[PDB]
Subunit: 232 residues, 3 copies
């Protein structure tokens, strides 16, 4: 499909902006990695080859993710999160190594680690906003999810980081569905408030059992409540 | 459509060259604006939305226009046109702010100002082309179009400035309709020398008439003289 | 959905990487050449013209080839090869001139010369490979191809150079078909062992330099041995 090559071109220009940032921040590793990924994308494009674009898109994704987690690591070092700094710094070095190595599935591994680190940055902000609002039950959930995802990165288990991304994702969506339930009380619309309340509890209780399976069901039923707010 | 996304990619690569020129011509404000517009374009493409890609194309147009008017402002600064320098500088700063603000309606305003300034640079050159050539009288008309577009910014009238672009555009059209008009000795440009003269005379009086109903018609009928030359 | 404009878009990003390198090595000549080619490509694409893209694709190829032959000249300065350095330096200068003007007839000329210079870098390595492992043929052949390709470039001859590349390529393909015959002893196969040996001599015996007709045939019969292994 003429769609895989369009992202190969779009991600190439996207990584090119990162290469300009590497030109103006003094970094040579980031510039060379960015050039490497964009060059691989071009070499994939020039033959009308489909598997080479999947590989080069994975490399461009890893370069963009390195750029994101590098600034997130700087943000964590600035804001006094020395542990999140080391976890991001670790995932950054592992991604850089995997790209220098050329191991396609190890980049997939490192890309997953960077996704969890970014999700930890998000759940931390949601947890701190939840404590700002005085909630100690979503706070317990969000804190239990970050403290379970970081422990998983401390071990480097690829299938335990995937499990922790599941919980973190549901905790992020509980925020949305809880705001929607709060606003579904203002119009008088109870067909949106019941649906949101059912998705909140069935996701919170899913994390209460901590079952890898019941969070997936909660995610789809949470999706069928966010879907309704996305209609209007 | 697909043609809109290829235009977004072409303008993206086009603005990136401008960002490359910013490193070697000394401007860093231009680099940030270029990075901003290209980032919005890339992420606009990555979601396939029709208004936001049109929006990012409008912003990339504004960044390119800033680059053009910046070279025009320096050229006016060099050639002792401090008045054209300040109007270009004003349209440049308003464009930068309109993008910095994110107000699309302010970007359209500033983009309109930048094109009008660019048209002022051109209509001045047709007057200078008259200095290169002999004298066809007129000349005050081109000056009347240049100095009325300049006055147009002093009021910022919404039902104006486009009118001044209209006059400047027709004065720019004097260039084409007369270049072909020169070729008419014994062969007499296919004998349709009258049609160029009919477009010349009925436009000369039209710009003096200050009309906005039929001067557009005169502009299109000058193009129907260019149309036949566009075949050969 | 046509495809040549996608080739122009890929080459644009490819030349942009070279333009990033020109920004950081102090070289502005390459930046101007890169800017010229990419701008010509961008403005050709934005109106859907096909002939202008064929031109711009030819020019972007010349800018990339300039980047390749410039680093080859840099490599030649280190290893003390004044002959390859000056031939590369000449092939670069004519391309730079041809791009600066926009002359299509000189770009084709300069691209061909850059093709021969790069092929001389390759045949040099194949000649040294034959000398290392005690070869009584290839050793003389590869050296004779180098000494005749340099002969054509030393003159700036557009016509006589269009002949030495044939031998250089055939000497390069003898390497491949000899590797295939050597591996056709290792695999246990019989359809790649007889015919690869059949293709080797048909190129080796084609030592007839005044042949100028069957060197293409030897290339095609080597293509009829190498290409089939490219399936699996």
């Amino acid at each position: 499909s003429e769609e895989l090559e369009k992202q190969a071109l779009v991600y190439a220009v996207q990584v090119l902006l990162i290469a300009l940032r590497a030109i103006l921040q003094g970094d040579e590793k980031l510039f060379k990695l960015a050039e490497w990924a964009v060059e691989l994308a071009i070499k994939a494009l020039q033959n009308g080859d489909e598997r080479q674009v999947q590989r080069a898109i994975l490399f461009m994704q890893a370069v963009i993710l390195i750029q994101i987690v590098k600034e997130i690591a700087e943000e964590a070092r600035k804001q006094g999160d020395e542990k999140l700094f080391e976890l991001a710094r670790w995932a950054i070095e592992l991604a850089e190594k995997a790209i220098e190595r050329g191991d396609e599935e190890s980049v997939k591994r490192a890309i997953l680690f960077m996704q969890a680190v970014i999700l930890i940055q998000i759940v931390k902000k949601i947890a701190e906003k939840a404590k700002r609002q005085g909630d100690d039950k979503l706070f317990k959930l969000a804190e239990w999810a970050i403290e379970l995802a970081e422990r998983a990165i401390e071990e480097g288990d690829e299938e335990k980081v995937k499990r922790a991304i599941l919980f973190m994702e549901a905790v992020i969506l509980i925020q949305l569905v809880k705001e929607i339930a709060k606003k579904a009380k203002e119009q008088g619309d109870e067909e949106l408030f019941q649906r949101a309340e059912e998705a909140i509890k069935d996701a919170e209780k899913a994390i209460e059992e901590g079952d890898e399976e019941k969070v997936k069901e909660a995610i789809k039923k949470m999706k069928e409540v966010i879907r309704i707010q996305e209609r209007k």
